Amino acid sequence: GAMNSSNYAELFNNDIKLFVDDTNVYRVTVHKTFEGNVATKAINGCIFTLNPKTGHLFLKIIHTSVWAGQKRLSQLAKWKTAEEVSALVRSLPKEEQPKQIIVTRKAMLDPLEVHMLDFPNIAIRPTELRLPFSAAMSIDKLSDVVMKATEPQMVLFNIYDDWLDRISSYTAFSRLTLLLRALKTNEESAKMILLSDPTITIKSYHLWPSFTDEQWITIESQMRDLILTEYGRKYNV
Amino acid sequence: MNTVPFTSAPIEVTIGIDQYSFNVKENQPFHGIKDIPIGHVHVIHFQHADNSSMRYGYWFDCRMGNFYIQYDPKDGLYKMMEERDGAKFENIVHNFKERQMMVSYPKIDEDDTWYNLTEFVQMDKIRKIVRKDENQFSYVDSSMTTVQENELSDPAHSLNYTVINFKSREAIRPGHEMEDFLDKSYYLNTVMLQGIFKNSSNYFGELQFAFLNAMFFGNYGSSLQWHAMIELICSSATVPKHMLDKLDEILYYQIKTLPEQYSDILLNERVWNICLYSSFQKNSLHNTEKIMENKYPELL
Numbered sequence: 001g002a003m004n005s006s007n008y009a010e011l012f013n014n015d016i017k018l019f020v021d022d023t024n025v026y027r028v029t030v031h032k033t034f035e036g037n038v039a040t041k042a043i044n045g046c047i048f049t050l051n052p053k054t055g056h057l058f059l060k061i062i063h064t065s066v067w068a069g070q071k072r073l074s075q076l077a078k079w080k081t082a083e084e085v086s087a088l089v090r091s092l093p094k095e096e097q098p099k100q101i102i103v104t105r106k107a108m109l110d111p112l113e114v115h116m117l118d119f120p121n122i123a124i125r126p127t128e129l130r131l132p133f134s135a136a137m138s139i140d141k142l143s144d145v146v147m148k149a150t151e152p153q154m155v156l157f158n159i160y161d162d163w164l165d166r167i168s169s170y171t172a173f174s175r176l177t178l179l180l181r182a183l184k185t186n187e188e189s190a191k192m193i194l195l196s197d198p199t200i201t202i203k204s205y206h207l208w209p210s211f212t213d214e215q216w217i218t219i220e221s222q223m224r225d226l227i228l229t230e231y232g233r234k235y236n237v
Numbered sequence: 238m239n240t241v242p243f244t245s246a247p248i249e250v251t252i253g254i255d256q257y258s259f260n261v262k263e264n265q266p267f268h269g270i271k272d273i274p275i276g277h278v279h280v281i282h283f284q285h286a287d288n289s290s291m292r293y294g295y296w297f298d299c300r301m302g303n304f305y306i307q308y309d310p311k312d313g314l315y316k317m318m319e320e321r322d323g324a325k326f327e328n329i330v331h332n333f334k335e336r337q338m339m340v341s342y343p344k345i346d347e348d349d350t351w352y353n354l355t356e357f358v359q360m361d362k363i364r365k366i367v368r369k370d371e372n373q374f375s376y377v378d379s380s381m382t383t384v385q386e387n388e389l390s391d392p393a394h395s396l397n398y399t400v401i402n403f404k405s406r407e408a409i410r411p412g413h414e415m416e417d418f419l420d421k422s423y424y425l426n427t428v429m430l431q432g433i434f435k436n437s438s439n440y441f442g443e444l445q446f447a448f449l450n451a452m453f454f455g456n457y458g459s460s461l462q463w464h465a466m467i468e469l470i471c472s473s474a475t476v477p478k479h480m481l482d483k484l485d486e487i488l489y490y491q492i493k494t495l496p497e498q499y500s501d502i503l504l505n506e507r508v509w510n511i512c513l514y515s516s517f518q519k520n521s522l523h524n525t526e527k528i529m530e531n532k533y534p535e536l537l
């Protein structure tokens with residue numbers, strides 16, 4: 001059924017699985033019209049589909065043209081997401097297809113289940129974890145490819161860079177979720193932490209800086225402090 | 238007018254015939270029910286005084302043979318049987334009526350209730366849902382499961398209702414996933430009505446039969462089927478106008494007849510609130526919405 005803290009190591013076993021986050025698919029700016037009404041303008045979005053064991057990220061860029069002339073866009077967005085996930089699965093060799101797909105929002109369950117009826121053996125599950133994948137667009141290289149896209153496009157990344165050479169998937173996922181939680185809580189402070197030291201750079205083929213093991217421990221601690229700070233500033237503690 | 242004669246009433250039992258129920262006492266002078274309206278299916282049902290477990294009964298149509306009831310002390314129930322000896326049957330029934338050994342089906346002449354509950358129900362279609370081709374009448378009870386229920390265990394003792402499942406490949410056209418899931422008209426009109434039922438009269442007949450098995454036997458799978466067939470219509474944006482008008486009448490009489498004390502277990506809150514207040518047809522069921530709001534406002 002649902003995925004929670006009790007069955008958390010399941011993410012890192014050898015059954016292929018994918019997380020799907022749709023929170024950045026339909027993105028708008030709200031603004032005033034010349035007549036003083038309010039209107040939205042869509043901007044490019046993305047589906048965030050992640051294998052938590054390998055770090056493989058299938059970033060499907062959602063170009064604003066897909067919304068043209070369509071109604072009820074927030075509902076369409078869930079069905080478009082499910083359509084694209086289903087297309088991705090069909091594109092993969094059978095031995096690479098996931099055995100489970102975990103959606104980060106329960107409103108994706110029925111859309112994905114319907115699109116995946118042809119795959120009765122693939123389990124579609126919710127999660128009680130509140131995962132910070134909405135902050136994927138605070139990773140500069142992912143945000144850049146989304147905003148520059150002029151047409152629908154899929155781009156593949158490893159969201160763990162080379163970390164798995166040195167740490168386990170469990171630890172790599174914990175790092176990722178801590179980094180994204182911090183970026184979600186205070187993007188500017190998080191980025192300052194990540195890029196303060198100009199001698200630590202981001203390789204052309206990476207998303208995150210080339211921290212040594214020691215430095216990652218320092219970084220990870222600083223990101224905890226930030227999350228604690230904002231929790232203090234927020235709740236006045 | 239036709240007659241369901243008994244051979245005798247050896248165990249105390251509540252007997253029902255359509256919407257009427259009466260008690261028969263441990264060894265009381267009882268040879269059956271007379272004056273049964275010809276032209277409708279009927280159901281004669283039983284609940285033993287000593288074990289209200291298992292309501293059970295028989296759907297039959299007197300135009301299809303001479304039927305009687307005889308208790309079986311081995312299987313412990315009242316069984317329906319056909320008499321092939323027509324002269325024997327008439328003699329027996331006559332003899333019985335002379336001695337006033339029968340209760341009277343009391344049809345108020347103003348009253349169209351049973352017609353309105355069974356308008357589309359046909360014995361031939363009942364016998365396809367209830368598979369026992371050697372008898373002209375059909376046995377149903379509280380515990381019989383449906384084909385769909387058996388998918389999710391004796392195939393011969395099951396109710397073969399038409400399986401309806403909104404997240405199924407039958408319900409959903411490849412490439413119309415959102416459209417077909419949010420608007421069930423394809424499933425209703427092409428798959429079910431044109432494809433499976435052939436016409437709305439057969440669809441309504443199964444719907445009415447499912448309701449009556451739910452109400453008279455507490456059959457849970459029948460209740461599921463009744464609600465699924467309602468939801469399929471109300472969840473379709475495109476429904477023939479005549480079907481919506483008839484559905485409103487059908488449901489009206491079903492809600493009117495439902496025992497108030499059973500509404501808690503026979504009415505699915507989610508289906509009814511969705512159908513009456515959120516669905517494509519939320520404003521097409523005027524009579525049904527009025528009786529539901531005045532009789533069962535708690536459910537809503």
Ligand SMILES: CCOc1cccc(B(O)O)c1
Nearest residue numbers: 254257258259340341342343
């Ligand atoms: C068909 C036999 O109908 C009867 C006979 C006596 C009493 C009742 B009653 O309404 O509870 C019904």
